[PDB]
Design a protein around this nucleic acid. Structure first.
Ligand SMILES: [Zn+2]
Ligand SMILES: [Zn+2]
Ligand SMILES: [Zn+2]
Ligand SMILES: [Zn+2]
Lengths: 199, 203, 203, 200
DNA sequence: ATGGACATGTCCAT
DNA sequence: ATGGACATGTCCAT
DNA sequence: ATGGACATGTCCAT
DNA sequence: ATGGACATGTCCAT
């Protein structure tokens, strides 16, 4: 289907807000988020956490879906999926139940449920809203990406962007944040290059 | 106990003094392909046409054929079979409009009688062709090989050094000749070759 | 009342049967102009008098006139206004001794009542001339046109082809008909013409 | 409207040697010089390198001036201007703050001055001496050729040679060096103009 | 005024 | 870049 | 073709 | 987990 995913930032009546724990002057860790460019840099397959704040508590049945999209209008249609090589590839595959096919996995929550919607094809990952445990904390999820942005036959260097959706108990959406991302072996030397290069 | 189909590296000049020689190449960096006689590495590019001068003093027995088969140069990889990275295999490109099996890595551009052998005892891929007399040309007789995966492809070769093996055979399958060399499918064979010739030219 | 932004193309003979007959073409190889009814497109050389017969089944409404406006053949380039290449426009040649604007491409050679218009809304350059009835033992009204830049000119047509629109209209402008055709201001129409028919008569 | 310019070849105090990039066998690069015919063939609007040498070093105010001239006697007086079409076309000007009517442009040195004699008319491009690479390369420059020798309204295909005058601070010439040139759409071809030389 | 040869430029694959 | 087919206009003789 | 810049990733000593 | 050299392919202009 020539269906294209919705990507506007929905605050949420609950002012659903997505943010990144801040890096205190770090160079080349596993990941890094640049507010400077509103795109994060997570080295492939490595874990990566994204924090979640809100305004008012979300009804029961509430979950959130991390979904990937190619940013440039060319391949916006073309769905984001794992490159032939990796998908197939014995490592980070064997033993691991999470579909070999997808790009976004949720190492951490076992209940975290994937999806491969037949209607569109746009596969993804979900888990229901866990309130922060100790009080006015922020629910955080562990994500990890199974293919660099460079992966050929895969994303294929095409700049992708992520759409995290706070959703109903059914499928409806009450708020969603997005941002670009890029899988680099050395995220950082890349962000550093990015900023410095332009402004 | 008899028929061993694990490839045989060391080369056998044979009873017709088998010799696999080259033609000069566009020493220019981007050259489709280029040979480094010294380092004895053939530098060819993906799917681009690479020729290989082959001759013998006396003529080979009716039925004679030629086989080119890929073998990982490193021994910790020797075991592994050289199959075009599943990436390309599954690629719809370079495969459509071809009789040549995309599963394979080495192809023969030009010979209508090209037979792509796929060993069912060892699982070794390769390509065989009838021997072909050098009609009016200098002794050299040429085969036109193509390489469908960069030695740098992932899943597949994965930067692993491959060493090519050209064999001389009887319909019997029996071997009369054999010669070999290191190959590296890349972009910029020139660059790459110079590079290597100066690590050695260095020490 | 000349309301269509982009010049109106598709044919309309109208009430008074409107027909644009092409005089017997100087078949000759380097003819000033020669007309291929085949490709229903003609070839005048540059500025050499090019006539065109014009027939009509009944008498046209007093004050009616004929309009010749040049328009590019394909949309890829259609929005542009067929203005003379600035070389010629700015020319010192065929600039002087002209009632017609160096800017204009088409001129009515010989009508002491010729008229060049420049649509202040669209930017259309054309040339209107009052209708005048066919006369002695003839049913054709004849107007002789001129073309001030061959397709090869740079500042203007840069090899891009165009269609001519002989419009038939009320003084207020309202059209009573129109006929068109591809034109190529060349040198060597006889040649050019056959060549076109030939690079096509096969497939 | 005026008298011609200084046409001869002047070596000068400092043996001001003008020369080209020697070639490996090239068939159609952007340009090429034919020693047999003392003329160059740059493709229109293309990059074109002129190599220079001297002997002793030139004073400070030293500049180098590139100027075009018609070779054909009859035409000679005439101003080597840019073709009408080209001058003012969809074709580039904005990217070239450089005059849109002067034929020889200097793609590179952002100090190069394009002048038009108010007396003669002669448009020409100037830039001060740039000592080698302080290395050996002997200060080569970059020339760009707005219009073909074919483009009309302009050169209207009449042979031209371009004198390069190394000049003083004031305006004196210490070294002049000329040679014919032909902005061909494929310099590859005038390889056979030299063929038509030994055509006999 | 006429047709053919040449002159110069554009488009194209590797 | 690097030749090779063709687009197009001009010169030269008839 | 062609070479030069450069995009993105692997290998390392700490 | 940090900074650095290099491996490799692609892009761009030529
Ligand atoms: Zn991948
Ligand atoms: Zn591959
Ligand atoms: Zn014109
Ligand atoms: Zn011009």
């Amino acid at each position: 289907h020539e269906f294209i995913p919705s990507n506007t930032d929905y605050p949420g009546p609950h002012h659903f807000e997505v943010t990144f724990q801040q890096s205190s002057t770090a160079k080349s860790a596993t990941w890094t988020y640049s507010p400077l460019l509103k795109k994060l840099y997570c080295q492939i397959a490595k874990t990566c956490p994204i924090q979640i704040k809100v305004s008012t508590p979300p009804p029961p049945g509430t979950a959130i879906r991390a979904m990937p999209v190619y940013k440039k209008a060319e391949h916006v249609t073309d769905v984001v999926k794992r490159c032939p090589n990796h998908e197939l590839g014995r490592d980070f595959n064997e033993g691991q139940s999470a579909p070999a096919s997808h790009l976004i996995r949720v190492e951490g929550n076992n209940l975290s449920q994937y999806v491969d919607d037949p209607v569109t094809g746009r596969q993804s990952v979900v888990v229901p809203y866990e309130p922060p445990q100790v009080g006015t904390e922020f629910t955080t999820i562990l994500y990890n990406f199974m293919c660099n942005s460079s992966c050929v036959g895969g994303m294929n260097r095409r700049p992708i962007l992520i759409i995290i959706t706070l959703e109903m108990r059914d499928g409806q959406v009450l708020g969603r944040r997005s941002f670009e991302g890029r899988i680099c072996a050395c995220p950082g030397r890349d962000r550093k290059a990015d900023e410095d290069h332009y402004r």
